[PDB]
Amino acid sequence: MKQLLEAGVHFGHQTRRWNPKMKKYIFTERNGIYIIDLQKTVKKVDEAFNFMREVASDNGTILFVGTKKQAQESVRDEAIRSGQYFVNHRWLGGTLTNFETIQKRIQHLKKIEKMEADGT
RNA sequence: GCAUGGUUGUCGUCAGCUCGUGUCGUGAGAUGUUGGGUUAAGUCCCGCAACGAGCGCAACCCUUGAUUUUAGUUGCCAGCAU
Ligand SMILES: [Mg+2]
Ligand SMILES: [Mg+2]
Ligand SMILES: [Mg+2]
Ligand SMILES: [Mg+2]
Ligand SMILES: [Mg+2]
Ligand SMILES: [Mg+2]
Ligand SMILES: [Mg+2]
Ligand SMILES: [Mg+2]
Ligand SMILES: [Mg+2]
Ligand SMILES: [Mg+2]
Ligand SMILES: [Mg+2]
Ligand SMILES: [Mg+2]
């Protein structure tokens, strides 16, 4: 349910393209591809589970960020179901530091949308 | 006219000149404005740590090509007499 459940395609990247900081997270070395300690994955996903417990115990706003082309259906669908927020296309430079300009553009689209339907 | 105001030529109606808020730089600064396409054009698109805006481009002005209403003299003459 936590170790054997995933199985399938849960391997790493090629040996040439790797980060040394991950030496503790590698199980074995396959042909180029590395192998990741699934035993570890369980503990740390449990800590992520508990951290999101603490975060979302109160009414909190969260963002699902994902652009990798094998990601842009999920983040959208569980963000819609969970009612939280997501960015699935490219990340515009400064959506948080320039939150003011981004929300001006949001207000622009929203106002012209009420123009289209609620207005003339 | 080499002390000036005003008026004009020229590149050339060529496509440029900048700002606000963010980020990257010890700093002067940088990015946007670089790259690939497309356009008459910084015209637009796709990329991309930038998101937008302003003066220049374009539009508003004049004329020409089609047509409707209003108006028939000094304009026009079709069906009618001269
Ligand atoms: Mg003289
Ligand atoms: Mg003089
Ligand atoms: Mg002179
Ligand atoms: Mg002289
Ligand atoms: Mg002079
Ligand atoms: Mg002289
Ligand atoms: Mg020049
Ligand atoms: Mg120049
Ligand atoms: Mg320039
Ligand atoms: Mg440059
Ligand atoms: Mg322009
Ligand atoms: Mg013009």
How was this model experimentally determined?
A: cryo-EM
A44 to each of A47, A48, A89, how far by Cα in Å? 5, 6, 28
CA distance A106 to A84: 17
**Cα separation, A37 vs A28, whole angstroms:** 9
CB A92 within 8 A of CB A67: no
**What is the spatial distance between Cα A51 and Cα A44, in angstroms, rounded to a whole number?**
10
Query: How many A from CA of A4 to the centre of ligand 7?
Result: 71
The first and second tokens of residue A109, run together, are 């689209």
Q: Comparing C-alpha atoms, which of A75, A73, A55 is closest to residue A65?
A: A75
For residue A42, the CA-to-ligand 10 centroid distance in Å is 47
CB under 7 Å from strand B: A 90, 92-94, 97-98, 100-102, 105
- CA distances to A76, A88, A99 from A80, in Å: 6, 12, 22
Strand, coil or helix: what is A44? helix
Rounded distance between C-alpha atoms, residue A12 and residue A17, angstroms: 10
What is the DSSP track for A48-88? HHHHHHHHHSSS---EEE--STTTTTHHHHHHHHHT-EEE-
Q: Ligand 8 mean position to A65 CA, how many Å?
A: 43
For strand B, the positions having any atom within 7 A of a protein Cβ are 20-23, 47-52
Query: Rounded distance, CA A89 to CA A68, Å?
Result: 9
How many angstroms separate the CA atoms of A12 and A18, rounded? 9
Of the candidates A52, A89, A98, the residue with the CA atom closest to the CA atom of residue A67: A89
φ, ψ for residue A92, nearest 5 deg: -60, 135
